[PDB]
């Protein structure tokens, strides 16, 4: 099974924003071979923000 679809509109836009941010201001550790727990964490932060 596959939950994340990194080719759609919203996922690709979010990933492009993250890539621009990481180009300008580095993160702690890169996202080499992106997993799905990263997407779940992003969605959880968005859930807390929305609530």
């Amino acid at each position, epitope marked *: 099974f596959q939950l994340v679809n990194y080719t759609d509109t919203i996922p*690709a836009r979010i990933m*492009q924003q993250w*890539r*621009t941010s*990481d*180009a*300008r*201001d*580095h*993160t*702690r*550790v*890169d996202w*080499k071979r992106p997993k799905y727990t990263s997407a779940l964490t992003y969605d959880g932060v968005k859930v807390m923000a929305e609530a």
Partner: single-chain antibody
Amino acid sequence: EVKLLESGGGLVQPGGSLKLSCAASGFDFSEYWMSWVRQAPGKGLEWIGEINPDSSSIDYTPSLKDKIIISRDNAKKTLYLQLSKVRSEDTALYYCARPRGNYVVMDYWGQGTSVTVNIVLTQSPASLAVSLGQRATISCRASESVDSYGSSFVHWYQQKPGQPPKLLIFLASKLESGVPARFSGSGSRTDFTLTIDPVEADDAATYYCQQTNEDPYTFGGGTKLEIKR
């Protein structure tokens, strides 16, 4: 390790717009965004343009933004920068580079060429010379912090005149891949340091400490290294 090709360095006519062929061979500029930097003779490099991987929106140099426009395409993996009102000092060595943030092997800048039409740091010692097999430790003092966003956010580019610059050490945790250099960022590094051991005739070049932790990435003065016979 991605490979780049940049050829055609030649003068132009007064103001005659120019363009350089920066081909990203064996890879695509969608996995590592392509950025064009500009280094004059005997001076630190300057970011001429930062582009996007998905070919959505590119930037321009913070010095003269509207003065130049650099087009590029991910699938084509070929970029071309243009400008107008070309002056003498405007003819500086422009070089393409891939995004180093993806991997260490991705930090593979193009060849680079010149024509005849930030970051603050100081590396020491400026005049260094040791025989083959020696261990050299250069210290690059700075004014900003020594680590940004968890780990270190400084790098060291091993450039040579007319040769493609290479990024040996970066972020004190990811040294140059493919050809692992014995020198790399280490320790707390209040001043960026790398203990090259053992040196060789191939590892003799100008090491310049450019810290990405101080916006923007600007190559500093650096320290010279040779092969003392």
